Amino acid sequence: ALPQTVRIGTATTYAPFSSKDAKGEFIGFDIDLGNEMCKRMQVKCTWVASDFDALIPSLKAKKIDAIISSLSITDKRQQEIAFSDKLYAADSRLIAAKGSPIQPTLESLKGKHVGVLQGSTQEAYANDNWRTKGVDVVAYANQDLIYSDLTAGRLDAALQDEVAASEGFLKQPAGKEYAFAGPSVKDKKYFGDGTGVGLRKDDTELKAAFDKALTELRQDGTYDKMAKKYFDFNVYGD
C-alpha cells in the first residue's frame, strides 16, 4: 500500500545533511540516505523543500509523507508523529567567536544574543532554560540566517546540531574565526536520541519499509560508504 511517490520534506539549509547545490538541487547525507532507502523500497521519491518548522505541520496535513531533515527523535514529537529507526546521532552545541568564554549556561549567556532555529529542539531548550530568564534567545526561520547573523556580530552565539555546525560552518571559510563554545549540552528529554524519518503514526507500512531499507543499507556497508563522503567519524553513534 506504499504510495507510488513518497513525498519527503526537508529543510535545505543544514549542511552537510540537507542543503542546495549551485543548481538548486538537494544535496547532503539526508538526501543520500533518503534516495538510497527509496531505491530499496522500490518507490519513487520527490523531495520538497520547506522551512524546518513547517515540516511536522505539513506531514500531519498530508502535504508530505515523510520528513528527512535531521529530525531528532524526541519524547514530545512521538506524541504527534512516528519515527523510523535512527538514521544518525545528533548532539547539540553552542558556537561563538574564537576565544569566546561563552558556556552553555544561564550565567554565561545572560545579556547575550543567542540564535536558534524556529521549530527545533534547540529552540525548545533555549526558550525554556534561557529565554525566560533574561537571555535574548532569537528564533530564526532557517539556519543560514543564523550563521550570517553570527558573523555579522548580531548574534553572540548559536545553538544547533553539533555536526551541522562543525561540517556546515566551522570547517568552512565563513566559520574560520569561530569555534564551539563549551561542550555538548546534555539534556536527553529536549534533544532526543538521534534523528529519524518522521512519519504519520498510522503509516505503519511506510515505516516498516523505511526501517527495512535502512537496516539493509547499513548491513551491506552502503551507509558507511555514503557517510565517508561527509564524515571521518562514526556519525551513526551507538
Ligand SMILES: NC(=[NH2+])NCCC[C@H](N)C(=O)O
Ligand atoms: N534541516 C534542518 N534544519 N534540521 C534541523 C534539526 C535540528 C534538531 N535536530 C531538531 O530536530 O529540531
